[PDB]
Symmetry: C3
Subunit: 66 residues, 3 copies
C-alpha cells in the first residue's frame, strides 16, 4: 500500500535516530547532534502522521463498506 | 470519527513544528526554541498515541465482528 | 492483541515524558533532562512505529480477506 512506502522512510530515519539515541545513552552527544535528533524526530513524526491519516481513511471507508 | 479530531490537533501542532524544523535547518534556533520544540513533540506524541489506541480498538472490535 | 502490549510501553514512557513536559512548561528543565527527553522520544517513536506497522499489516491482510 501507500502506508508501506511511508513506513520505509520511518525505518531509515529511525536507524539514524537509533544512532543518536546510543550517543545519548553513552553521554557523548554534541549540541549539533542534539539539534539533528530534534529535526529527525520532527521529520519522522510528519511522516507517521500522514501514515496515520491514510490508515484512518482506509478504516472509515471500510466502515462505510459494511 | 474521533480519530479525525485528534488528527486536526496533530496537524496544527505539526505546522509549528515545521517552523522549528526550518530554524534547525537554517542554523538559527535558540535554546528556548529547542525547548519549545521538545515540548511540542511530546504534546503531539501524546495525541498520536491516543489516536493509535482508538484505531486499534476499532480494528479489534471489527475483528470481533467477523 | 500485540499492538496492545506495545501501547502499554508507549503509556509508561509517556508518563515520564509528561513529567519532562511539565518541567519545560515551568522553565526548570536541565540539559541532562533535555537529553533524557530526547532519548525517551526516540524510544517511544520506535515502539509507535512498530505498532503502526502491525496495524497496517492487519488492515492489509483483512483487505485481502474480502
Amino acid at each position: 500500500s501507500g502506508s508501506e512506502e511511508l513506513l520505509e522512510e520511518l525505518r531509515e530515519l529511525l536507524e539514524r535516530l537509533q544512532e543518536l539515541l546510543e550517543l545519548i545513552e553513552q553521554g557523548k552527544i554534541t549540541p549539533e547532534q542534539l539539534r539533528e535528533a530534534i529535526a529527525l524526530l520532527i521529520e519522522v513524526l510528519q511522516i507517521l502522521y500522514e501514515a496515520l491519516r491514510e490508515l484512518a481513511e482506509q478504516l472509515q471507508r471500510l466502515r462505510e463498506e459494511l
